[PDB]
Amino acid sequence: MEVDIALPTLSPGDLSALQRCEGRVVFLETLRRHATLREVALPCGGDVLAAMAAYRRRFAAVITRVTPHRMLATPLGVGGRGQSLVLQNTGPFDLTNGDHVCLVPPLLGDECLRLTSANLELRFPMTLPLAQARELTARVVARAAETLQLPPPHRDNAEAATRSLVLNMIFLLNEGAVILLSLIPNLLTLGAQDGYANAVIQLGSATRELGQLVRQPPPPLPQDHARRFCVFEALEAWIASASRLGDTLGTRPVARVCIFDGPPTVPPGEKAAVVEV
Amino acid sequence: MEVDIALPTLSPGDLSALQRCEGRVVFLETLRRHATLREVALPCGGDVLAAMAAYRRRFAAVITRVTPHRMLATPLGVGGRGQSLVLQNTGPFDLTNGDHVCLVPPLLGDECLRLTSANLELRFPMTLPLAQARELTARVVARAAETLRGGAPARGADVVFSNGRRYQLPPPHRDNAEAATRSLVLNMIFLLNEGAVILLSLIPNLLTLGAQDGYANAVIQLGSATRELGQLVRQPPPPLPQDHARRFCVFEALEAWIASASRLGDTLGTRPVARVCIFDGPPTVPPGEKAAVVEV
Amino acid sequence: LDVDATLAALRQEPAEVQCAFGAYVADARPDALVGLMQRFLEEWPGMMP
Amino acid sequence: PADQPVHNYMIKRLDRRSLNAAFSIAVEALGLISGENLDGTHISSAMRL
Numbered sequence: 001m002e003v004d005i006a007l008p009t010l011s012p013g014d015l016s017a018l019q020r021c022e023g024r025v026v027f028l029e030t031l032r033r034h035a036t037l038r039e040v041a042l043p044c045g046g047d048v049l050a051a052m053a054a055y056r057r058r059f060a061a062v063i064t065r066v067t068p069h070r071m072l073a074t075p076l077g078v079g080g081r082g083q084s085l086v087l088q089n090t091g092p093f094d095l096t097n098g099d100h101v102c103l104v105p106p107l108l109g110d111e112c113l114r115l116t117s118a119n120l121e122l123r124f125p126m127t128l129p130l131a132q133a134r135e136l137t138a139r140v141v142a143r144a145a146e147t148l149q150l151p152p153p154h155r156d157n158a159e160a161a162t163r164s165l166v167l168n169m170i171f172l173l174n175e176g177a178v179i180l181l182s183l184i185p186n187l188l189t190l191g192a193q194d195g196y197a198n199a200v201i202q203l204g205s206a207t208r209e210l211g212q213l214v215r216q217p218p219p220p221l222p223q224d225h226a227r228r229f230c231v232f233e234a235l236e237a238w239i240a241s242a243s244r245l246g247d248t249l250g251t252r253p254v255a256r257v258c259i260f261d262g263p264p265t266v267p268p269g270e271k272a273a274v275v276e277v
Numbered sequence: 278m279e280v281d282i283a284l285p286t287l288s289p290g291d292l293s294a295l296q297r298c299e300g301r302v303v304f305l306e307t308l309r310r311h312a313t314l315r316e317v318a319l320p321c322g323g324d325v326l327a328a329m330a331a332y333r334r335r336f337a338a339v340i341t342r343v344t345p346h347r348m349l350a351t352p353l354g355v356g357g358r359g360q361s362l363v364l365q366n367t368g369p370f371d372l373t374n375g376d377h378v379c380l381v382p383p384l385l386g387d388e389c390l391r392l393t394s395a396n397l398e399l400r401f402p403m404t405l406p407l408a409q410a411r412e413l414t415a416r417v418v419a420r421a422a423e424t425l426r427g428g429a430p431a432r433g434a435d436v437v438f439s440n441g442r443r444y445q446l447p448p449p450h451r452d453n454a455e456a457a458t459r460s461l462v463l464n465m466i467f468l469l470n471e472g473a474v475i476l477l478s479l480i481p482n483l484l485t486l487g488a489q490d491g492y493a494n495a496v497i498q499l500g501s502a503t504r505e506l507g508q509l510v511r512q513p514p515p516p517l518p519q520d521h522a523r524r525f526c527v528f529e530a531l532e533a534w535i536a537s538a539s540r541l542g543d544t545l546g547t548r549p550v551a552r553v554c555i556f557d558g559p560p561t562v563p564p565g566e567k568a569a570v571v572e573v
Numbered sequence: 574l575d576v577d578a579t580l581a582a583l584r585q586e587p588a589e590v591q592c593a594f595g596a597y598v599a600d601a602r603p604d605a606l607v608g609l610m611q612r613f614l615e616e617w618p619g620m621m622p
Numbered sequence: 623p624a625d626q627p628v629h630n631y632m633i634k635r636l637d638r639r640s641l642n643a644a645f646s647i648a649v650e651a652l653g654l655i656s657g658e659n660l661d662g663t664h665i666s667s668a669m670r671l
Contacts, residue, residue: 084355098334142528146528148512162510172476180422183426186425187425187463187470197463200464201467202533202537204525204533207467229419235418235419239414239547243547244542246540258336259308264623518590
């Protein structure tokens with residue numbers, strides 16, 4: 001399948017600028033075979049949180065050719081996992097070989113191929129490696145939680161992010177989880193005889209600030225402490241949650257980079273082969 | 278895209294052992310049509326967390342036929358149409374037909390080739406069905422945790438079933454299970470406690486609601502629309518001037534926790550790498566025996 | 574003696590107050606210099622985190 | 623890894639300058655060469671030459 005995006009008549013002042021966008025990704029809404037350019041288009045920059053929430057509700061598409069009439073595309077993932085294509089990087093950090101990439105809305109705006117003749121503008125999302133996209137989502141959601149190079153939130157959707165976060169956190173509290181919660185001092189004392197044990201604990205740990213301020217008594221034996229065991233259940237639940245906490249706030253990694261011959265690290269603004277996942 | 282591996286000739290006898298591992302998986306570094314055996318090697322006594330984190334920055338590849346000269350591999354990530362391929366199951370328990378496999382390090386007692394002629398070691402990761410692996414990880418971690426607090430060291434229920442037969446979950450001291458897993462249990466238990474503490478610090482009165490009518494009502498209201506009982510998160514007290522030795526900004530701690538939790542969740546596998554589509558064979562493949570698979 | 578530009582450009586950082594004992598004065602009231610020093614010393618750490 | 627053969631197409635623009643000089647000739651010569659004021663005296667043709 002090859003999504004076909006039709007174009008209206010264009011002035012030569014912007015057609016030649018659109019030609020340069022040969023390896024960026026756009027977000028359709030329905031996967032019909034044909035679709036006009038006006039359809040696939042997002043308003044000018046605003047509320048990076050809302051936009052990041054919108055990328056979840058639509059499936060991406062990367063474009064390959066730009067003819068004076070017609071502009072092709074490719075629906076990224078609907079049935080395929082090995083359609084090796086090429087897409088250019090537009091994020092600040094240079095993405096290296098091996099790691100996955102995730103789509104993130106742009107910061108500060110200023111990335112808008114404002115077309116005057118057609119009277120519309122596009123905002124192609126930037127591409128970041130997973131390790132840094134996670135951190136960016138963390139920073140933005142924390143800042144949203146603060147309000148009860150950086151744009152301010154809107155207080156209408158930030159509450160939705162807070163709701164998702166607080167739900168995913170609330171459902172960690174289990175009658176088994178308290179058993180683990182009981183050994184905070186037994187953990188700190190273990191984080192003293194060795195080096196790695198102390199290394200795993202952070203500095204503003206938000207728990208060392210607790211284990212040295214409050215004593216907790218032995219836990220109450222739960223109902224039927226003979227038949228079943230609770231710590232196992234709580235830990236399994238926590239694995240199940242944390243395996244899917246990153247995506248529920250940001251976006252799943254959409255493709256991983258593979259290059260057969262070129263230099264490993266590809267700089268910003270340069271195309272690099274890829275395979276999707 | 279099939280890569281070959283130069284093989285520094287070892288000896289008779291050992292080469293037979295290398296021939297016996299004609300089905301396992303190996304983690305390459307980069308997709309080049311050549312590679313030296315010295316490259317795909319890991320000290321078979323190693324930290325499980327770091328190995329599981331490194332498994333992401335590599336490519337899986339299965340060892341097809343081997344010869345005294347070289348051995349041929351086939352990567353799994355990139356591929357055309359997802360062609361079939363053979364795989365040697367090496368987990369502790371069998372895997373059925375029509376499910377998904379996942380790659381985890383040798384969490385329990387380890388097995389590792391010791392190629393004494395070439396003086397290098399190899400680790401071949403286990404091959405587990407999805408849910409059973411996601412539960413076995415929790416099993417080993419929970420056993421280590423129960424041991425940690427010096428409580429009742431045994432409960433006779435550290436056992437896992439799979440297709441009838443009962444498995445024993447070998448004792449946790451065999452190779453280095455008291456040392457090569459400490460990192461994992463620490464890094465998991467700590468994050469769990471930190472998440473709990475942050476939540477309780479943002480909502481101080483959560484555990485003083487109705488035992489059955491308040492907490493459930495709060496959860497159901499939170500899951501539903503925007504009432505939220507006002508700022509259900511009470512405004513935390515104002516922090517210190519960031520040079521006082523006891524500054525504590527709760528929100529930056531929440532930020533660090535989100536980041537670390539996401540990172541830990543991604544470096545755990547649990548995203549299927551293949552799927553057994555065996556055909557013309559016994560529907561249940563026992564451990565140690567090959568099994569037809571199609572990559573996902 | 575051109576500081577107006579320096580200040581007008583340096584105040585972009587919102588704020589941070591490390592301490593206040595070093596840059597604050599106060600107009601005393603009568604009944605001074607016997608118990609007034611006592612009223613002062615009692616909260617001397619109150620100015621120095 | 624191996625490297626592919628790379629090409630590159632580049633163009634470069636010209637630079638444009640000029641030159642000039644001055645040749646101001648007098649008025650008496652202007653007249654006499656044209657002969658408009660040349661009177662048939664044996665002394666005028668010498669001035670023409």
